[PDB]
Design a protein around this ligand. Sequence first.
Ligand SMILES: Cc1ncc(C[n+]2csc(CCOP(=O)(O)OP(=O)(O)O)c2C)c(N)n1
Ligand code: SF4
Ligand code: SF4
Ligand code: SF4
Ligand SMILES: [Mg+2]
Ligand SMILES: [Mg+2]
Lengths: 286, 295, 310, 312, 394, 394
Amino acid sequence: KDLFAEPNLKQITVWARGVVMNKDARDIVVALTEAAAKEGKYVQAWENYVDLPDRIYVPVRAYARISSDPIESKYIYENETPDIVVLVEESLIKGVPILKGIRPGSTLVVNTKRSIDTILEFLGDTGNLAQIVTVDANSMAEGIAAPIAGAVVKATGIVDVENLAAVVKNPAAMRRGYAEAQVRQLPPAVSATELLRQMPFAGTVPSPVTENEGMVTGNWRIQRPIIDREACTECYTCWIYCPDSCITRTEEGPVFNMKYCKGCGLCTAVCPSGALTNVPELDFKD
Amino acid sequence: LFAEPNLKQITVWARGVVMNKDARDIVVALTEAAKYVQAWENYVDLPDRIYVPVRAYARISSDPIESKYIYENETPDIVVLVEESLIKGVPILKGIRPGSTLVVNTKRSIDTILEFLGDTGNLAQIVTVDANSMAEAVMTLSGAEGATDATGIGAGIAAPIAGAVVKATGIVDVENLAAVVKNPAAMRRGYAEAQVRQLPPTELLRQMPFAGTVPSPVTENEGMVTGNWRIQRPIIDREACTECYTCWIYCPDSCITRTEEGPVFNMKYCKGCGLCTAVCPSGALTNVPELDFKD
Amino acid sequence: MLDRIASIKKAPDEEYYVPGHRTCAGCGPALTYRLVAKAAGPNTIFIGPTGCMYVANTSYGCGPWRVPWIHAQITNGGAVASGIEAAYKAMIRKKKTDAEFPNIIVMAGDGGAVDIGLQALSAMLYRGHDVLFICYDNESYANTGIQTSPTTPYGANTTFTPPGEVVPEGKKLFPKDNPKVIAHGHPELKYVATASIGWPVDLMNKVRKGLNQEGPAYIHIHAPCPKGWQFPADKTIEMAKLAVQTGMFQLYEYENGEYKLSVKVDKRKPVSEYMKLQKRFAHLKPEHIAKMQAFVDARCAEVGITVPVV
Amino acid sequence: MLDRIASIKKAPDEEYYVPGHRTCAGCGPALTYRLVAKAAGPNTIFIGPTGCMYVANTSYGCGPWRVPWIHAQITNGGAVASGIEAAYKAMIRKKKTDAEFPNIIVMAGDGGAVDIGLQALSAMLYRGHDVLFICYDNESYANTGIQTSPTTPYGANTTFTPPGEVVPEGKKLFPKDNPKVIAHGHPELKYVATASIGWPVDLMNKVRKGLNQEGPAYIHIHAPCPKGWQFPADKTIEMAKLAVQTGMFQLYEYENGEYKLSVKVDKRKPVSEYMKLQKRFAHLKPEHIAKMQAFVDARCAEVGITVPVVAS
Amino acid sequence: GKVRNISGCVAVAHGVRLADVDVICSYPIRPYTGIMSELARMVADGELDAEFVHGEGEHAQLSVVYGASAAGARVFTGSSGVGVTYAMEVYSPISGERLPVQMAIADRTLDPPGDFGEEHTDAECCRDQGWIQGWASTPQEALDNTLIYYRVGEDQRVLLPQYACLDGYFVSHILGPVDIPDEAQVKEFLPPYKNHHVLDPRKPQIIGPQIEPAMGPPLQYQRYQAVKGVHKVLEEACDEFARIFGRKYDPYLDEYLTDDAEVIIFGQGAHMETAKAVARRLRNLGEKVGVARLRTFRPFPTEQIKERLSKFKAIGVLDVSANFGISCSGGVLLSELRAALYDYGDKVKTVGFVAGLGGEVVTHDEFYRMFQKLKEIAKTGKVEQTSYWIPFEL
Amino acid sequence: GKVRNISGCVAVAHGVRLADVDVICSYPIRPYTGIMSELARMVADGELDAEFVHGEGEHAQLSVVYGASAAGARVFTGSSGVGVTYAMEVYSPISGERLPVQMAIADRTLDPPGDFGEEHTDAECCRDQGWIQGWASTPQEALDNTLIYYRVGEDQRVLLPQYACLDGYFVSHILGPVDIPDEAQVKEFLPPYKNHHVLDPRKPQIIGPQIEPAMGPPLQYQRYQAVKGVHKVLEEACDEFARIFGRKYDPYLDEYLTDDAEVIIFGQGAHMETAKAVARRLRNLGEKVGVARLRTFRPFPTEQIKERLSKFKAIGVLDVSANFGISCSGGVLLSELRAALYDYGDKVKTVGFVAGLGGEVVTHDEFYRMFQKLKEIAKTGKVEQTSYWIPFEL
Ligand SMILES: Cc1ncc(C[n+]2csc(CCOP(=O)(O)OP(=O)(O)O)c2C)c(N)n1
Ligand code: SF4
Ligand code: SF4
Ligand code: SF4
Ligand SMILES: [Mg+2]
Ligand SMILES: [Mg+2]
């Protein structure tokens, strides 16, 4: 990586919820790359091919590469060492490795109404993260691409504001995100043998017994079903309709497994007693 | 540079399907009876059609055979006909070697047969046997495309015809051939009742059209003349014909043409299936042997 | 529009399936091809998947068809037909040809229509191409040396189903009814019919009826195989007529969800009087004939034959 | 023999489709798989032709099935199943195994059952293998990014059927009714059924009924796709119920030549009340909806749904 | 001459559009799906007038365009991975009946690995089917090869089907500057499709009869000579393409800094662009290394390689594929290059490099490690193993 | 061992019978059909207890035995010509899932030419699929290879499917003396089939899951190493076959009069029997000629050839196949032989001969003209063209 490094290349990783918010992650990246191309930068914009096919509420990604020099890392699927991490949905700070391989002097841009301090309770160790940015793009767009993109400029200054104001459909919401962004500065690979050893005979793996730990899907959750047991009739309509087998029938009633629950809200929608409520995930620490 | 003097070639012509099994069993019984032997059916004639001239070849040698992989016997020593009408319109005398023998299954006289053959060339002997009365023709779907025959070898008219071949050439012992056939008794008849008579002393690339694509015919397909399939031909009695043209609409080969004089039968392609005779409601059609005609 | 054929005498003289082909003597499918070509006319394109009516007709480097013809795989009879249809409708629309829309006919064997070409068949009916798909049925893979097929009758003798101590009937399976398979589920399918060479006029009319339709048509034709079914070369029409008169093959037109029987069977004969004339059933015991009959009874009920067996 | 399921309360708690798979939130086919595995039991072998229920469930290097499972091509669902059946009946007869004859179930997508896997399906029914062939129908090639299929409804929007001035409806072709295709012509076929995830007990019982048969069975299960049909992830079961209540999908059991309706629809809603909830039909004009309605009416006539449309 | 920043998938469709293709048969499989999706949109919006047939499978895809071409229409289809092997039966009849069917292949691994990434293995199975076959490394070239292979393949002295191949994801998805030509440029370049045989009731022909056993070799040798004459027509097309479209292509080899090179890396596809990026940097460090990208895989430029690549001490051959059991345990390119440079076998050292397996990126570092291995061979003149499976062996 | 004069079809069926195959899937195509007919008879007559599945096609055939192998049963199927290419998609998953499915191939030309004769072309399409592949030249060898390929392929160190190939008509139909082994001889030779994974409800496994993109190469490399280890097991099987059955086979090359030979003809199949008959005769004229018949096509004996065939002045390569567009315009064998003997490219001259097209017999006269050309090259040390298409060019 010494002979083929690119110091002029900035990597951007934009996390989003699959299907529902993939375009939002895309519009952020495209607007940024188009804005840098007006300054003469060499840019690339694309969606994570690895996350395909995209599923509903699955953590997906959209990457950006901006360089003053011709890009020689085009054929690389993912940005492995991001400089700017962007979240289109707030709950992505919970249970999703959005800080893996971040480079020094990096910035975290999050779309939320919660305080930065509360977010750090979900980030844990911030590592080499230099700055954190919070913007309420939900109210500004009322797309949310421009207010988030505007908040990125305020902290990194990758492209000029006027240049980005010429590529967005809503420049007004962008400037708000550029102005109301809350910035806080923070203090500053396996071998092929093992990669071969981790490959079982013909790819044949044993069947699970109780759960499939190869795919823990709790971090898909934007919202979680909350039960009111005094309103529960124990009809178990919810139990027979969960696509992810997250409900167990007990004497106390239906118990919801939060390790895999994707928060689709099916159980809530079909419940005739209204004993279930969809509540944002960031109201929970577990 | 590659000749084999100890190798005798045998070419056995037959009518497809009906006598394909019989012609094979003739060849197989002899090779099993003998030395170095080879027995197979003409792969070119496959799949066999009804009344189409097919072939079964044999090679028997005192020395190891080095010409096994050749599809056909190009220089036959023994020509065998299981069906009488095969002398008509079928190249059964191509490449025949000196000191050869012609074995024919028929009840007809030798003199009549010679009227269709013309010049016999290097043909030395001619043999006729009435295996029709001695045995019965056998057909089966088993033993096809290389499969084994569950009915065995030499079950029908194969052995009596094969026995007549032995009487003239003496290629194998009767008892050896009697141990591979299902009817040694009928074999003894064919070996004994056989009547033998001694006889008096680059371009292919240019011919390849574009991608093998050929233009559509207009009136006929001259690439496949099937008149020489006939063991029998339909003969009409026009005073019995109602000109209903029932025969015309049931001919698989479009050999009937509707004229003002009535149905005209095309003898160039007619396979003599006898359907027209069978489906004619007026009975104006009759199946008559092909060898009753000179044209 | 192809007019109805009143009779055998009033049938056209012009042949588009000329003399000269290496088919068996008294070949059922050969007559099938001849009658279809006769009813189709000059404005016809034939698609011939690999089988008897391809190999036997073209041996060697020739063909009996007076109209255009192309070889197809046994796997893509209808698939190729779909392409020829789409091409002409595109070449015409874009004014790249002055050619009139031709009759597009597939002559698929039972294996290439019921077994290995069924997938390419169903999808053509699904896309609703203006193509006439015909199955000539000799109830076996005939060209390969008579091997078992989904249309091969129960207890029939083939090289893949030989009778033995373990399998007394040879073929334990009852045949697949392809006409009933595709008659349902395809909204674009406008005309289905079953025909027999025993009834040449009815056959040609069904073909012309299918060609006249503003969509895909399918005609399942019964074509006796003397070589495969093991019977004399001059009894093919007797086998074709007997097959209907005994209930082994049903003649009808399934249109608009309702069956219309083609030939009037006052009394149907037992199957034994039909199977005894064929050496492919020569191994079956009276228990097998009964099972065949019970099956034929159930098969005849499906089309509307309520008359008892005489 | 798998006993009949009386109710949800009387439905088994045991799951054979555990949590942990990369399927969409509120995935219809995922629930289908969950219900099928629950009704099947431990003595079951699953065959998964390439599609969403293969890719999404096994991603990556894992799987949710407590029972044996093998990948098949999208082209050979029934062909592979036939092999597993033929193998077990032979290994048992020759005393080469003590294993009892298992439930052999194919979980094919609509493409893998109606389009590219149809031939391997029909031929399996012809050979009469003791196999349950199930088609979960999301009315598209979903895993490849939602492309048109023979079960994709008329005028539906896919990446292969986009609406434009030349083709305003996107898809001009009306869907193929595969259950009726295979219901005829196959003598060995003993049990056919159509099911929906809106009716879980009815769904599971039909599976158990098909498995209890000594031959080939086919069950076409309706499984709404939130990602493909473009509707909220929590409206999948409402969509399944609406599909039945509007006549888009018919629940029945065709046995011995007669259709037997599963659910009693006293009154049918117009097709608009089902298609308005899905953005794949969002391009259609009231005239296209009319062609759809006429088609659905005729579709209901074939099986015996004679009840009129309310407020049509 | 409008320049656009489009992916390979869209680029191919624009090439197909300008070709005025009459029949298109589709089916979904990544990453070629976008081609049919773009083609479906173009038809739906009236950008192209064409029959867009929904095939029931890939075997059907090639079957449709087979029959459509025989009816005299210009056709286009495509597939990927196991879609390529599913339609395997239809490939040979298409060439044998001389039907210039063009099939785009965005490469994808077979099963296994599965539906993720690319390998050339799928398209390399069709090596014998008698088609024109080559890889485009960039979206611009994918558009160009579409028109060219139509020009070369539909040439009446050739009349052969073509495999317009392009790397999965790396060419199909990644954006690139594409000069989309004008129709007058294409009208000037590509004449209407006309074969010697066609299905037409006005001029009846019998296409594909069962031929005589003795007529086997003449039919085989006829197509053989047709394959041999492809190269001459191809060269004329590249000279004509440069004249009309302003882009000069080499008919056989895309050579980059090979004049003074001591060792080179031979290969095809987009990964050679990466190889040029590694070669460029090593050239600036004073190391005489080069890269030779194969533009035409079929018919193989045997003598062209023998003439132009026989001046190097060592040649590394990259095979982004899994051709199991093959000689020298590398790939097809290794085997076919050694065959071409056989007379120089004692002098020109050759070694095979197998990478990019499962769709993995052949990284810059890996290309560096290849070039360094070549120097060891160039210094010693010896080859330990004929192939190295990266990154497990080198 | 009872000696009988049987065809290749019957010989193969007896090998299948002696292997006690549990599942058989069939389909008709010339000229391999006869195998299944005998197998159908053996089951019907109770000579073999096996499930005889009537496949709807070749794609299904390989698909059936795929699932059947996964259920732990020994399986058998087969095809020819376009039947081999129709089931093409299934080859990779079968090998990739390590299922030792054996498929007998009685070679037949594709379409075109058609339904007449044999070419190795059909089986040579499956060269990359990761199977065991080799040609039997005699009916006896066809029976022997069946048992050998089962033992080697089902070996837990191998676990790979096999292509038991044999020439169409020339081996399949042509009768030959076959020593049919005893059940005790085979039982000693061939133990029951046992794989590492199997579909069993008591011990559940997930066979063929979608793997991680990064796990692509290790899975490919895992099967790569498995292919490499085939030769060692093959040698052990040939040594063991000789001990039990009394016939000693060479694992890679059947050489005839090559010890002091100056020029040889390299190839595979039954036509090599014709070559052995011609070489002896020229030897009697004082001409030092030889024949080296390839017994194992896959995995290719690269190093074995480099060691044993590098002592000859000239080598003629007969390719009874039509691999169009390939390097040197010969066949696959020419390219893969030159690749193995690349290090000796300046000394050991090699030339390709393409004959037997359309199923034609490669006559003695044709082999004579090959042998004469080899002496001409050996005297001059020069090769005009790398291939000759007989009899149009030689
Ligand atoms: C022979 C073949 N062709 C194409 C593909 C590509 N492919 C992968 S998933 C998929 C979708 C399968 O569709 P469907 O059967 O409806 O199942 P679904 O994805 O909807 O669950 C396709 C076409 C393939 N794997 N194999
Ligand atoms: S659906 Fe509602 S009422 Fe019924 S069991 Fe679940 S929480 Fe209780
Ligand atoms: S086998 Fe049957 S269909 Fe074929 S040519 Fe002979 S009689 Fe006709
Ligand atoms: S695309 Fe449809 S079937 Fe596939 S996972 Fe998503 S919702 Fe389920
Ligand atoms: Mg047939
Ligand atoms: Mg689907």
